[PDB]
Design an enzyme around this catalytic site. Structure first.
Site, PDB file in Angstrom:
ATOM      1  N   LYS A   1      13.776 -14.484  62.954  1.00  0.00           N
ATOM      2  CA  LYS A   1      12.712 -15.160  62.222  1.00  0.00           C
ATOM      3  C   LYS A   1      12.081 -16.200  63.141  1.00  0.00           C
ATOM      4  O   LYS A   1      10.868 -16.418  63.115  1.00  0.00           O
ATOM      5  CB  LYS A   1      13.276 -15.832  60.966  1.00  0.00           C
ATOM      6  CG  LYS A   1      13.772 -14.849  59.899  1.00  0.00           C
ATOM      7  CD  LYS A   1      14.633 -15.535  58.818  1.00  0.00           C
ATOM      8  CE  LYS A   1      13.848 -16.524  57.956  1.00  0.00           C
ATOM      9  NZ  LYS A   1      12.719 -15.859  57.242  1.00  0.00           N
TER      10      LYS A   1
ATOM     11  N   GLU B   1       6.856 -25.680  51.791  1.00  0.00           N
ATOM     12  CA  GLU B   1       6.487 -24.283  52.010  1.00  0.00           C
ATOM     13  C   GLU B   1       5.419 -23.799  51.022  1.00  0.00           C
ATOM     14  O   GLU B   1       5.573 -23.963  49.813  1.00  0.00           O
ATOM     15  CB  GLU B   1       7.732 -23.404  51.888  1.00  0.00           C
ATOM     16  CG  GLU B   1       7.439 -21.922  51.928  1.00  0.00           C
ATOM     17  CD  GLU B   1       8.649 -21.090  51.592  1.00  0.00           C
ATOM     18  OE1 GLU B   1       8.502 -19.851  51.522  1.00  0.00           O
ATOM     19  OE2 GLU B   1       9.741 -21.675  51.398  1.00  0.00           O
TER      20      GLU B   1
ATOM     21  N   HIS C   1      13.040  -6.452  44.716  1.00  0.00           N
ATOM     22  CA  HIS C   1      12.968  -6.322  46.169  1.00  0.00           C
ATOM     23  C   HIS C   1      13.460  -4.944  46.541  1.00  0.00           C
ATOM     24  O   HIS C   1      14.664  -4.677  46.514  1.00  0.00           O
ATOM     25  CB  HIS C   1      13.831  -7.379  46.849  1.00  0.00           C
ATOM     26  CG  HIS C   1      13.474  -8.779  46.468  1.00  0.00           C
ATOM     27  ND1 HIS C   1      12.212  -9.299  46.656  1.00  0.00           N
ATOM     28  CD2 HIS C   1      14.208  -9.763  45.899  1.00  0.00           C
ATOM     29  CE1 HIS C   1      12.185 -10.546  46.218  1.00  0.00           C
ATOM     30  NE2 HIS C   1      13.383 -10.851  45.753  1.00  0.00           N
TER      31      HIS C   1
ATOM     32  N   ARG D   1      10.197   0.483  63.701  1.00  0.00           N
ATOM     33  CA  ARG D   1      10.599   1.851  63.445  1.00  0.00           C
ATOM     34  C   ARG D   1       9.409   2.506  62.770  1.00  0.00           C
ATOM     35  O   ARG D   1       8.302   1.977  62.823  1.00  0.00           O
ATOM     36  CB  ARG D   1      11.809   1.846  62.494  1.00  0.00           C
ATOM     37  CG  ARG D   1      11.626   1.017  61.196  1.00  0.00           C
ATOM     38  CD  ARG D   1      12.883   1.056  60.309  1.00  0.00           C
ATOM     39  NE  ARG D   1      12.772   0.268  59.078  1.00  0.00           N
ATOM     40  CZ  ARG D   1      11.899   0.504  58.094  1.00  0.00           C
ATOM     41  NH1 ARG D   1      11.038   1.512  58.186  1.00  0.00           N
ATOM     42  NH2 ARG D   1      11.897  -0.250  56.997  1.00  0.00           N
TER      43      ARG D   1
END
Lengths: 558, 558, 558
Positions: free
Chosen positions: A118, A188, A223, A280
């Site tokens: 990250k 945030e 998710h 990928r």
């Protein structure tokens, strides 16, 4: 220019069959590898050569790089495709392939662990002009620094610490700050009804890079992508090229080579932010192929061989709309849980117009509790989006699966939901309309038992004896002398049981051919699925497969 | 934007299956309706849901609007397609659908009864600049007014009254006038060898409208289209756009919305006149689709949903040539009469290049005496017109139909007529070459009976007994001791009977595999159709299916 | 404009079926002709009508023009296609067709015998600006004239007389001349590693003419094209249009009409020289069709009918690469000899992407010693050349042929040769790498016999008696009481025999489904061909079909 003679696919299920089909399409031989559990699997079956790896858990089976690369050397593979999941994203394995002379249809190891953090990934992204979700770690002032910080981060902002307090106005920031317990506060940015838009990036070795339109993958079950589409329903040309260029600069940044997608997130306000890049090929890649006529695996193979992307960005097509759905062995109204059992019934939907289905199973197969329970991916293309939707819906109607719990009834509802037609998408769509998506059973009407009985009775011929082959005694008819046809059946569906008594001085009503129960409820001739597999009769009723069987007085008495 | 979930097709036969195929292609469910006679029909079979309407006569079956719309509401249809015939053109029904919330894939009710009157339709047409056949009703002067009237109407003019006297010169107009009996005289223009050219018009809701090239439908059996083609063999670009624009202005005129065609008529002199517009889809619509790659039913569905035509006139393609033929259960040399019976044999012609066949039947089906006897429509596309013709001809060779009288032998001749190849078309083509089109039988040669016998004998194995399965006694051989193979058959074809005696000390000659009789008339190995259906042997002989069966001494003696 | 109703194909084998398929595609009937030996052939089978010609030798069978044209008149053919070989190039026959009213899908008789003479053909070619191989006949001076002559002919020159002395330098020309025995000396240019490049020419009646790219046919087995490709791997745009124009001027020269190709030859130095023109269609024509999407036979038919070529040179496409291989009944390591026998096994390779196969045989057919032993032509198309190659290679892997000796193992090696991938082509390629192309057998390993045994044993069920149908005694199992499964087989492959003893207290190892032997050599699951035809088991082993059968103690003892 290197060149693959045999391509080893270090993966399983649908994706393994998927890549293998493209290889075959080029005259390239394919090598599979399997755990002991997948020793008799479809991907191993459709493989020119297979190689036994570990045993059961992915931990010591498909994740065993050393063995996978050993297999490749032994089976004569000149390259490795890792598909998604497993080892498709970890430079260690990508390097080990290099340290073997094996081509690795993937991004160069560098980009992999670079995007794997990250931190450093947040680094490279800012450098290339890729917007990031405004935050504010490190420093944690009180009632004054936050005011300035929060001001730039757009005011619909959140407040965390070091382990929520949704601020909506600068005038609410006051009390928003004086809250610390259990000072140390983070700022945030919070996003309003954010759509998940990712861009399909694809480079080569020759520095060229391009984005192949974008995909929306907003509808997610706690998710986990459930539905995907291309293009992203709402956004127009400008917004597309903006996010595309951003993603392309992101890939150029770490010197990307293969296929991969940049996963963004854009609020109702059009601002899009980088979340992470997948080093990928994407699972939902079929919808992209649909609207572009491109075989991303072929491309994936070609860059590996070191050729140059066959197009320039002015050529990347984008005509029509394609929707993808993921069929899993989960449980709709069962808190979504990896239901692993045996596929007693598995009928895909006939080839037809914009229809596509990438699966990794077949009837009789066992859905092991060791791997992703994804049965298949159903993709429908259409000229408009309604077309793709209506077609895809038809593919879900014509698909049946019995012997397990399936998210299929769930998916049928989603495509058939007014909310989904209207494209009212954001990543909370699933948890929002849950009430309509995950209903609750209604016992079934006498309307049903009559139907089920007829069906069963007709799936049970009568025994023709070699002794006397044309004996009228073989009729499942119910023939009675002067009165009307009598047949009585002790059926049991789910955990309920009825004693359907069929009477009809009118031979009509129901008939049954192939896997279709043709019923005639006085005036309306309707037809539904009724498939017999073993001692079980799977009947299609109100968009939900119901398993019916005969009650066994002896079995249970015991 | 409305949107169809299920489309109800208020019609039957070929067209019903036709529309249903397009629906299915879009993921749209289809609903059928049937009379009691069509309860077991193909269109009902290929329908997702069907609904029983009336009983037998169209009068109180498919013409029963109230029930058809009731069905639609009940079966959950959001729209209605009426196909051609029945209720496809009568505002009453089109309005009743409106008064139900049902979309009606057709023109708005207005245009319907507006074009339904020879009067008011003649009105609107002149207003929009659509040429009409010069006439002269109302007034009926004597030897002076007609002279001026006739003069503008072109002199090859006719003379009627109030219930013919073909005038060719102004100098013949003299005696042409002094003829009244049984004064009151009408002046209607007469047309010389007129070709029937119609234009495929198609609008939407958004005022856009265009013509999809034209079709020639000149070859007609005593009024009734028999053959159709697109494009119209003779006319060039200018003439095309002229008639097209005319038709388009005609549709704009009454504010048209769906599909429909303007039926013109143009003499040898190039002048084209309006005859009538069909406010539905045309039967012969396939030839248009052929040369344009367009699905008119899909389009028909889309405008209903309210989308805009996907093209501009500069895009309406026109490549290649396609010819359509109508297969009916009529009687070639039998004054053309609705022969209704049972389809004992019905073999369509294999899929192949430009081949297309839109049917509504299948073997075993009964051709009821209540509806249009149209079995199927055979369409062949070709690059040139010879190609389409030669292909279509091959499709007619490979098609067999037994148990009824068929216009198939007739159609074969038409495509294979020098007159038709040369495109010598005008609406009198049928009655002109009748002598070549409707010949008269020739008893069949000994050349034939030998062939028929061999065929029959070989369609009759020999009975293998479970007692002794390989018994050489099962040979249909004719084996004799020292002499030659002897087999004698009492056959009866049509109303004639022969006692074919087959002898051959040479096993060769004929053989038979599948539905092909392979014969070897010393040197020339030829192969023709020979199909066994029941106690009947249908043999292809000189482009005419002949039914052959064995004579039954007992049956007849009785 | 004439027009064919039935096309007679005066030829046999693959090409006959080939042309016949195109005819059929246009709705044109096809007529075949056969020798007595091909009376039961495939081309006769796929023909609408056939006609018996001579008997066995081509001399008095397919070469009998008078009969072939007689057949055509009798069977109702309006045209004749001679395919390649036989009478496709001899004005006599081309004229005889003219003297019959029959269209002859070929060049006008003139061009035929004009190009049929090395002389006059050398004439017309120079006139049209077609380079010829510099020579020097007629005059034969001594040590002075040759010096000048040789100087222009490029110095890598040869020296002949009147019935070699390869000169490389002008300084070597000295001794090069003083050598005459057994004065009279010829000066013919010698070519270095020359590639065989021919151009596909195609004209019409309307004077138009064009070249359809070029084909390389360098790889040749002792003179005889073995492999072909289009386009010619090396040369670029300029060189292409140069040779094309040359060939086109060559055809314009003799007023060519149909299809034909100009066969050139270009050294390492880029200079290309005319060798001869084929006044027919080329055998290797499929690779051209592949990269152009054009049906040369259809075209061939159309010009005959007198239409104009559908394209201009600016339109002749050229996308992708296609490679063609010729499957013969020759003997790889047997000095290449017309091996004529019976096709006990013949399995072509499944339809798949760029795959094409034009054959003239089928299993069971006999390969007569009277005609070209060509079984089939396998063509693979690919986007790049590696694709075509890799695909074509796969088609050779999936093809098996038993009961004869085949050049198939040979061809597999060629495509799989590093030399061929690298395009290191010149007409000596075959005789150069012969050591790698025509290896020599290795007795087969115990690795093999175990495999063959398992295979055989599993192709031999066990006899189920009607007496007792489920008898466990029918197992080919090898079941033994307490010990392990024992099965012993006396097998004999080629001229070798082993007594394979199969033992396995582990049921696993091998299985067999369809024509696939699935083996599991501990860890590696591989699958190969194993096809049973009669008392013979054809096993795929190391890219070579091996015939295996059981030893018969009695048969041989005798």
């Amino acid at each position: 220019y290197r060149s693959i003679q045999r391509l080893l696919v270090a993966n399983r299920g649908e994706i393994a069959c998927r890549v293998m089909r493209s290889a075959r399409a080029l005259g390239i031989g394919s090598v599979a590898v399997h755990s002991d559990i997948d020793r008799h699997a479809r991907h191993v079956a459709e493989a020119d050569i297979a190689v036994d790896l570990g045993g059961a858990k992915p931990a010591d089976s498909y994740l065993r790089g050393d063995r996978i690369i050993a297999a490749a050397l032994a089976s004569g593979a000149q390259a490795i495709h890792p598909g998604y999941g497993f080892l498709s994203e970890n430079a260690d394995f990508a390097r080990a392939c290099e340290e073997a002379g094996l081509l690795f249809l993937g991004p160069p190891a560098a980009a992999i662990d670079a995007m794997g953090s990250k931190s450093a990934a947040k680094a490279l992204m800012e450098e290339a002009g890729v917007p990031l979700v405004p935050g504010y770690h490190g420093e944690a002032q009180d009632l004054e620094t936050f005011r300035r910080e929060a001001g730039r981060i757009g005011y619909p902002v959140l407040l965390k610490a070091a382990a929520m307090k949704v601020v909506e106005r600068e005038a609410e920031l006051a009390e928003a700050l004086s809250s610390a317990q259990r000072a140390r506060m983070l700022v945030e940015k919070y996003l309003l009804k954010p759509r998940h838009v990712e861009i399909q990036v694809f480079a080569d070795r020759h520095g060229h890079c391009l984005y192949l339109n974008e995909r929306d993958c907003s509808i997610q079950r706690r998710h986990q992508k459930v539905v995907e589409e291309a293009p992203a329903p709402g956004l127009g040309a400008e917004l597309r090229r903006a996010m595309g260029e951003a993603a392309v600069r992101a890939a150029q940044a770490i010197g990307y080579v293969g296929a991969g997608t940049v996963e963004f997130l854009l609020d109702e306000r059009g601002q899009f932010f980088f979340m992470e890049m997948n080093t990928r090929l994407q699972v939902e890649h079929p919808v992209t192929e649909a609207i572009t006529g491109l075989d991303l695996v072929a491309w994936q193979i070609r860059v590996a061989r070191g050729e140059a992307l066959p197009l320039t960005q002015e050529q990347v097509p984008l005509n029509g709309h394609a929707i993808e759905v993921r069929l899993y062995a989960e449980d709709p109204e069962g808190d979504f849980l990896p239901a692993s059992g045996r596929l007693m019934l598995y009928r895909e939907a006939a080839a037809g117009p914009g229809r596509r289905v990438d699966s990794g199973v077949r009837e009789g197969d066992e859905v092991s509790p060791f791997y992703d329970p994804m049965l298949a991916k159903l993709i429908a293309w259409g000229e408009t989006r309604e077309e793709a939707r209506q077609r895809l819906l038809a593919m879900l109607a014509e698909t049946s699966v019995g012997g397990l719990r399936t998210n299929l009834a769930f998916l049928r509802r989603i495509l058939g939901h007014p909310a989904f037609a209207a494209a009212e998408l954001d990543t909370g769509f699933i948890a929002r309309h849950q009430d309509d998506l995950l209903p609750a059973p209604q016992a079934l009407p006498e309307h049903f038992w009559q139907a089920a009985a007829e069906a069963w009775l007709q799936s049970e011929p009568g025994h023709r004896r070699d002794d006397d082959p044309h004996s009228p005694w073989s009729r499942n008819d119910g023939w009675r002398s002067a009165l009307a046809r009598e047949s009585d059946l002790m059926l049991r569906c789910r955990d309920e049981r009825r004693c359907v008594r069929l009477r009809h001085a009118s031979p009509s009503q129901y008939r049954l051919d192939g896997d279709d129960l043709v019923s005639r409820v006085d005036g309306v001739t309707r037809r539904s699925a009724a498939l017999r597999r073993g001692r079980q009769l799977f009947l299609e009723w109100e968009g939900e497969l119901l398993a019916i069987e005969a009650v066994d007085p002896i079995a249970e008495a015991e």
